[PDB]
């Protein structure tokens, strides 16, 4: 194991990616809040930051509705032979009545 | 033409409107909620990899110059 | 790349989880290339009254 | 995200679906005793045309 | 001749702007758990530390 | 104009039915109004 190299731990590589996304999101929320709160900023960039704040507070609602529609879309394509490949339908071994019906078909012709 | 009324539904739990919990498993609904990893070298990595903020940078240099003048004026 | 993409997918099925890829449906070009099925599903959910 | 959390997630997922199957069985035995209970899925139709 | 004084058909009037509900079958919509959290997550402790 | 005084329910497989529009199922189910052989069976007559 000592002669073997060391490896990048993926389980912490994902966590400081999602956490960095959340930190950048919180910094952008606290940055588009300050751009409208002061009065020295121009109105062309005072209302634009307001709608950018509206669009940033509306993010997990968008995730909720987006998730909902995609869950229904995934339920459209569950067909019980994808998820259940060992489905037993029906079978019937050959009875004596089949051979009797065949012999009757050859006798009455 | 001949419509009938559904009488009454004695509803078991989890089969109801507003019968959903945060503790429920998201089998579908593919968006995840992720565990924040609080490790101190990873804290330093998160402090380094965060981009910037303008008012944060100006208040950082303001507080750093104020603390420098503080330690230089408290000595004599 | 086929050895990795058929190993994590080999873990998703054995664990029992299902669904879309989380990092694919998180962007905005997914809902622009799938513009056809969303106009169907939004009308289906809204007309049934579940939206 | 390690093994000891990834199996504890699967224990806090199977125990949900076992209670869900208990609810599913009770809502079947309710309607088999001629008591109109709701199921996991919604009630299908009404008296309108289809039964 | 002014319009609406022209002769018009004696018919049942239009029911175009009527709201209809739908009888959807039993297995059409999936079972939904996990109520989504609309509220944004707070990172006060991470930036405090 | 008459206000809606009743509850209206159509089944879910009839979601496609929209007034002032002719769906493909209406063409493939009643083709005689859309093959222009008889002048007294036009799609305007069908819509009426």
């Amino acid at each position: 194991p000592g002669v073997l190299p060391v490896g990048i731990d993926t389980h912490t590589a994902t966590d400081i990616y999602q956490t960095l996304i959340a930190l950048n999101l919180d910094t952008t929320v606290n940055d588009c809040l300050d751009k409208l709160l002061n009065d020295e900023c121009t109105e062309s960039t005072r209302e634009n930051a307001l709608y950018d704040y509206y669009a940033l507070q509306l993010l997990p609602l968008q995730k909720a509705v987006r998730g909902h529609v995609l869950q229904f879309e995934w339920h459209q394509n569950s067909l019980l032979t994808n998820t259940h490949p060992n489905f037993l339908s029906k079978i019937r071994n050959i009875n004596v009545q089949d051979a009797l019906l065949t012999n009757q078909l050859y006798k009455n012709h | 033409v001949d419509s009938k009324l559904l009488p009454k539904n004695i509803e078991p739990p989890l089969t109801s409107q507003y019968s959903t919990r945060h503790d429920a498993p998201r089998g579908l609904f593919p968006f995840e909620s992720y565990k924040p990893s609080v490790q101190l070298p990873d804290m330093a990595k998160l402090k380094k990899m965060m981009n910037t903020s303008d008012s944060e940078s100006t208040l950082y240099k303001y507080l750093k110059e104020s603390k420098r003048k503080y330690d230089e004026i408290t000595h004599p | 790349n086929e050895c990795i993409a058929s190993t994590s997918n080999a873990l998703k099925v054995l664990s029992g989880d299902e669904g879309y890829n989380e990092d694919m449906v998180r962007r905005a070009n997914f809902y622009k290339e799938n513009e056809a099925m969303l106009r169907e599903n939004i009308e289906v959910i809204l007309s049934n009254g579940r939206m | 995200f390690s093994n000891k959390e990834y199996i504890s997630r699967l224990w806090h997922t199977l125990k949900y679906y076992q209670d869900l199957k208990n609810t599913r069985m009770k809502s079947i035995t309710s309607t088999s005793q001629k008591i109109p209970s709701a199921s996991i899925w919604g009630n299908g139709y009404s008296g309108y045309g289809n039964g | 001749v002014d319009s609406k004084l022209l002769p018009k058909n004696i018919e049942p009037p239009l029911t175009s702007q009527y709201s209809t509900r739908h009888d959807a079958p039993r297995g059409l919509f999936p079972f939904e758990s996990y109520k989504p959290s609309v509220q944004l997550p707070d990172m006060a402790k991470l930036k405090k530390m | 104009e008459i206000p809606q005084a009743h509850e209206i329910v159509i089944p879910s497989y009839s979601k496609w039915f929209n007034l002032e529009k002719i769906h493909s199922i209406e063409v493939q189910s009643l083709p005689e109004f859309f093959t222009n052989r008889i002048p007294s069976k036009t799609p305007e007559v069908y819509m009426r």
């Binding site: 909720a64 | - | - | 009404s46 | - | 509850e7």
Partner: peptide
Amino acid sequence: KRVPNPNFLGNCNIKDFKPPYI
């Protein structure tokens, strides 16, 4: 004593199901 039919304005049998986020 009147009793409303299911074809009454506001007395449907198809109740409005609510989404989980609401």
